[PDB]
Amino acid sequence: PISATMVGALLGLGTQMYSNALRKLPYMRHPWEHVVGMGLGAVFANQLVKWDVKLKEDLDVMLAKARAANERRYF
Amino acid sequence: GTLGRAFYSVGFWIRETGQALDRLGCRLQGKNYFREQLSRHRTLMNVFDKAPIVDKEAFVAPSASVIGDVHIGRGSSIWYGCVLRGDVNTVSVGSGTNIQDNSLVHVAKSNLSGKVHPTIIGDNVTIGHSAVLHGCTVEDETFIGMGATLLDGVVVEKHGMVAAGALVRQNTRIPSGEVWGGNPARFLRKLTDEEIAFISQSATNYSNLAQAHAAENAKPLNVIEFEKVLRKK
Amino acid sequence: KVSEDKNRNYAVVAGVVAIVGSIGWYLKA
Amino acid sequence: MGTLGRAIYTVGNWIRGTGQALDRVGSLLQGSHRIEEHLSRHRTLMNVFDKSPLVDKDVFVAPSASVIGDVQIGKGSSIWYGCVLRGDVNNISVGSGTNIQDNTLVHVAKTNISGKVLPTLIGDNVTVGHSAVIHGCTVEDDAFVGMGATLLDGVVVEKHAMVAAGSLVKQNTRIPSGEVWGGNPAKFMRKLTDEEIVYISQSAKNYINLAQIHASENSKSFEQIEVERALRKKYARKDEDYDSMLGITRETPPELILPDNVLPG
Ligand SMILES: C/C=C/C(=O)SCCNC(=O)CCNC(=O)[C@H](O)C(C)(C)COP(=O)(O)OP(=O)(O)OC[C@H]1O[C@@H](n2cnc3c(N)ncnc32)[C@H](O)[C@@H]1OP(=O)(O)O
Ligand SMILES: [Zn+2]
């Protein structure tokens, strides 16, 4: 389907083309950089997904402690 | 077509990558010869699949520019500094025809002013030095004066003569055996038989002269000049 | 036959070391 | 140097081979349609019919110019970019201190239609403007041919005469001294003021000076081109504030300084 890897690869390729266009260069100037950008974007998207999962776990632990501290009031 | 154009584009990506790799390899060996500014002029230049088709017995000066779909026939000659650009349409040159030094034979760059007319040059035609032909037909055995300009739509009927420095306005027809000249081009007089003989004999003399120049240009490049340029201080 | 610029050669070695080391870093983590 | 030097050289060989193979594959994918750029076959000076051009020591010939056949060019003259001097069927003579400007054609005739066929003679201190066309005619000393002008066979431009820019001078027409002719066909326009005579001389001398800097640039070798490219980049901008903090004064290298005779002042 629409995995993180594909979204990241597309974003990285688009980032290399956008950069070339902002510099008035042909869209495909230095194609090996387009390959590098695809790889880096894929890696970044997958790592962002993993980091988001980890963040949620940490937040749940923090929210559990906050609710325990708040429930201590009614003791 | 479109698929050929896509393969041509993707091909350029592979070539760009390979040439970059070669430059890397030369850099690791401490060579900078790829930084040398050498002329990228091509005597015959293609624009995708529109390439020039030149007969083997046609002389083309190395400094001349033949771009796109250009047809040069047998015994014809493209002299020093000439430019022929048929890209939006075609440019065809007949046999035994001389296009003299610094002449420009091209078609309209854009179709904004209507459909782009091709340029047709007939047989045994003489085109004088620094003449401008722009989307016009020039029939067989005609004489285009040097420094003259022919605009799109013009027809120079067989045995027509355009005087040196003339400006033949758009869509003008030059009848046979007439000499037209001036800006704007206007009928001057009729062509005499001696001048017809001169037309044909001049086209023949230039075919022999083209042959002589082709042999001196095809002589192998001299190594001594190369070593002198290389060892300068 | 031989590349003379020593500093260039050391830089090349450093770049290769960085690439192989990054690959090993991924491979062992 | 050393073993590491040899290993890196060998690896560079492998990378070069891979790069050229990839270039070949990319050419195949293009359908072989692109015509390959080749070494330059244009010859600045060429022989034809066992005739060699006789060119003085101090003559600027632009590498893109074409000097062919029986051409004589005298001291201090200059042949500019795109000029074609084809002396294949007759002689072309250029005097001293004469400039033939960009994209100009000079040709001769073997036998004109009627009358005695003559070679092409261009005298001393003559200015010929851009994209002029000189065909089998005579230009005498201290004359001026305007840019885009056309002299046909048998034309004589006399001393201190001018042909206006863009003119068409018909066959056998004689421009006498002191006059300027112009138009299509060329005809008398007015007399030449003395200030214009001084202008003609100044034009010839200015072009003598311009030819020097152009000739010096066009004859530099690859190494000197690289040296001057680096120097030009080095001195393109400045930080005189930081220089004054360091207490140094960066000076423009002499190879980037033009002589004063070509400067506008
Ligand atoms: C040191 C560096 C040196 C160089 O590189 S300079 C060489 C390149 N520069 C040139 O070739 C341009 C030199 N200057 C000229 O040629 C110039 O024109 C010229 C030298 C005829 C003279 O041009 P003027 O500015 O002096 O024009 P005039 O008023 O004297 O002439 C009158 C008339 O001539 C006509 N006019 C004038 N000049 C020309 C022409 N040429 N053609 C046609 N028609 C013209 C025009 O009709 C004018 O009005 P009308 O009678 O109503 O027609
Ligand atoms: Zn000629």
User: D157 forms bridges with which residues in the sheet?
Assistant: D139, D175
Q: Is D227 in the pocket of ligand 1 (CB under 6 A)?
A: no
3-class secondary structure for chain A?
CCCHHHHHHHHHHHHHHHHHHHCCCCCCCCHHHHHHHHHHHHHHHHHHHHHHHHHHHHHHHHHHHHHHHHHHHHC
Nearest atom within ligand 1 for CA of residue D162: 20
Q: How many CB atoms lie within 10 A of CB D102?
A: 17
Rounded distance, CA D69 to CA D49, Å?
Answer: 7
Q: Which of residues 161-220 of D touch B (CB under 8 A)?
A: 168, 184-185, 219
Rounded distance, CA B117 to CA D58, Å?
Answer: 48
Token couple for B118: 């091709």
DSSP state of B114: S
SS3 C10: helix
**What's the length of chain A?**
75
Q: Could you tell me the strand order of the sheet in which B143-144 lies?
A: B59-60, B77-78, B98-99, B126-127, B143-144, B161-162, B178-181, B186-190
Q: Is the peptide bond before B184 cis (omega within 30 degrees of 0)?
A: yes
CB contact under 8 A, B7 and D8: no
| Contacts within 8 Å (CB) and 24+ apart, D198-202 | D200/D125, D200/D127, D200/D142, D200/D143, D200/D144, D200/D160, D200/D162, D201/D125, D201/D142
User: B173 forms bridges with which residues in the sheet?
Assistant: B155
- Amino acid at position B185, single letter: A
Q: Is the peptide bond before B62 cis (omega within 30 degrees of 0)?
A: no
Nearest atom within ligand 1 for CA of residue D145: 11
D105 touches chain B (CB under 8 A): yes
Contacts with D209 (C-beta within 8 Å, 6 or more apart), sequence order: D259, D261, D262
Q: Rg (Cα) of chain D, in Å, rounded?
A: 25
Q: How far is CA D55 from the centre of its chain?
A: 14
Token couple for B83: 């430019």
Rounded distance, CA B95 to CA D102, Å?
Answer: 31
Q: Please, are residues D71 and D89 in contact by the beta-carbon 8 Å criterion?
A: no
The residue whose CA is least distant from atom 1 of ligand 1 is D203
* Set of chain C residues whose Cβ sits within 8 Å of the Cβ of D6: 1-3
Give the H/E segment covering residue B181: strand B178-181
Rounded distance, CA A13 to CA A41, Å?
Answer: 8
Rounded distance, CA B25 to CA D22, Å?
Answer: 13
Rounded distance, CA B204 to CA B199, Å?
Answer: 9
* Set of chain A residues whose Cβ sits within 8 Å of the Cβ of B6: none
Q: Is D172 in the pocket of ligand 1 (CB under 6 A)?
A: no
Rounded distance, CA A37 to CA D227, Å?
Answer: 36
D153 closest CA partner among D179, D180, D114: D114
Rounded distance, CA D124 to CA D231, Å?
Answer: 39
Rounded distance, CA B61 to CA D109, Å?
Answer: 20
- Bridge-based pairing of strands D99-100 and D127-128 is parallel
Chain D: partners with 3+ C-beta pairs within 8 Å: B, C
Q: How many CB atoms lie within 10 A of CB B105?
A: 26
Mutate which: A16, A25, A28, vs B, most B CBs within 10 A: A28
Q: How far is CA B24 from the centre of its chain?
A: 38
DSSP state of B122: -
Q: How far is CA D193 from the centre of its chain?
A: 30
Q: Is D137 in the pocket of ligand 1 (CB under 6 A)?
A: no
B172 closest CA partner among B205, B209, B135: B135
Token couple for B189: 């007089």
Token couple for B98: 């001389």
Q: Is D182 in the pocket of ligand 1 (CB under 6 A)?
A: yes
A28 touches chain B (CB under 8 A): yes
Q: Please, are residues D117 and D90 in contact by the beta-carbon 8 Å criterion?
A: yes
CB contact under 8 A, D131 and B10: no
| Extents of the domains making up chain B | 2-3+6-7+37-218
CB contact under 8 A, D5 and C3: yes
Q: What is the dihedral of CA C28, D4, D6, D10, to 10 degrees?
A: 20
| Contacts within 8 Å (CB) and 24+ apart, D107-110 | D107/B100, D107/B101, D107/B129, D107/D133, D107/D134, D107/D135, D107/D136, D108/D135, D108/D136, D109/D135, D109/D136, D109/D153, D110/B205
Token couple for B52: 């020039």
- What burial letters (b/e) apply to D206-221, b meaning 16+ CB within 10 Å? ebbebbbebeeeeeee
* Residue whose entry in the numeric block shows the structure tokens 């030059």: B174
Q: Please, are residues D149 and D131 in contact by the beta-carbon 8 Å criterion?
A: no
Q: How many CB atoms lie within 10 A of CB D205?
A: 14
DSSP state of B131: -
| Planar angle of CA B164, B166, B170, nearest 5 degrees | 145
Q: Ligand 1 mean position to D176 CA, how many Å?
A: 17
Question: Greatest CA span in chain A, whole angstroms?
Answer: 70
- Amino acid at position B4, single letter: G
Contacts with B51 (C-beta within 8 Å, 6 or more apart), sequence order: B44, B68, B69, D33, D35
Q: Please, are residues D204 and B185 in contact by the beta-carbon 8 Å criterion?
A: no
Q: Please, are residues D13 and B26 in contact by the beta-carbon 8 Å criterion?
A: no
Token couple for B59: 């002389």
D49 closest CA partner among D65, D71, D66: D71
Contacts with B136 (C-beta within 8 Å, 6 or more apart), sequence order: B117, B119, B120, B150, B151, B152, B153, B154, B155, B156, B168
Token couple for D87: 């002396």
Q: Please, are residues A19 and A36 in contact by the beta-carbon 8 Å criterion?
A: no
D250 annotated as belonging to a binding site for a ligand: no
D88 touches chain B (CB under 8 A): yes
CB contact under 8 A, C4 and B29: no
Question: Side-chain half-sphere of D250: how many Cα atoms within 13 Å?
Answer: 14
Question: From the CA of D13, how many Å to the nearest CA of chain C?
Answer: 10
Nearest atom within ligand 1 for CA of residue D148: 11
D48 closest CA partner among B22, B210, B21, B73: B210
Question: In units of Å, what resolution does this entry have?
Answer: 2.8
- What burial letters (b/e) apply to A53-66, b meaning 16+ CB within 10 Å? eeeeeeeeeeeeee
Contacts with D68 (C-beta within 8 Å, 6 or more apart), sequence order: B80, B213, D45, D46, D48, D53, D84, D85, D86, D87, D88
Q: Which CATH architecture has domain B2-3+6-7+37-218?
A: 3 Solenoid (2.160)
CB contact under 8 A, D66 and B17: no
Contacts with B109 (C-beta within 8 Å, 6 or more apart), sequence order: B88
How many angstroms separate the Cα of B143 from the Cα of each of B128, B159, D94?
8, 7, 30
* Set of chain C residues whose Cβ sits within 8 Å of the Cβ of D10: none
In degrees rounded to 5, what are phi and psi of residue D36? Answer: -70, 135
D118 closest CA partner among D129, D107, D128: D107
Q: Please, are residues B116 and B143 in contact by the beta-carbon 8 Å criterion?
A: no
User: B167 forms bridges with which residues in the sheet?
Assistant: B149
3-class secondary structure for chain D?
CHHHHHHHHHHHHHHHHHHHHHHHHHHHHCCCCCCCCCCCCCCCEECECCECCEECCCCEECCCCEEEEEEEECCCCEECCCCEEEEEEEEEEECCCCEECCCCEEECCCCCCCCCCCCEEECCCCEECCCCEEECCEECCCCEECCCCEECCCCEECCCCEECCCCEECCCCEECCCEEEECCCCEEEEECCHHHHHHHHHHHHHHHHHHHHHHHHHCCCHHHHHHHHHHHHHCCCCCHHHHHHHCCCCCCCHHHCCCHHHCCC
The residue whose CA is least distant from atom 17 of ligand 1 is D164
Contacts with B2 (C-beta within 8 Å, 6 or more apart), sequence order: none
Chain C: partners with 3+ C-beta pairs within 8 Å: B, D
Q: Which of residues 120-159 of B touch D (CB under 8 A)?
A: 129-130, 146-147
Q: Please, are residues B75 and B208 in contact by the beta-carbon 8 Å criterion?
A: no
B137 closest CA partner among B103, B101, B168: B168
- Bridge-based pairing of strands B178-181 and B186-190 is antiparallel
* Set of chain B residues whose Cβ sits within 8 Å of the Cβ of A28: 9, 13
Question: Greatest CA span in chain D, whole angstroms?
Answer: 81
D209 annotated as belonging to a binding site for a ligand: yes
- Amino acid at position A27, single letter: Y
Q: Which of residues 19-58 of D touch C (CB under 8 A)?
A: none
A32 touches chain B (CB under 8 A): yes
* Residue whose entry in the numeric block shows the structure tokens 């066979």: D153
Rounded distance, CA D144 to CA D134, Å?
Answer: 12
Give the H/E segment covering residue B93: strand B83-93
Rounded distance, CA B63 to CA B83, Å?
Answer: 9
B117 annotated as belonging to a binding site for a ligand: no
| Contacts within 8 Å (CB) and 24+ apart, B173-182 | B181/B145, B182/D184, B182/D185
* Residue whose entry in the numeric block shows the structure tokens 């085109």: B127
Token couple for D259: 């002589």
- Bridge-based pairing of strands D99-100 and D78-79 is parallel
* Nearest Cα residue in chain C from B29: C3
B212 touches chain D (CB under 8 A): yes
B32 touches chain C (CB under 8 A): no
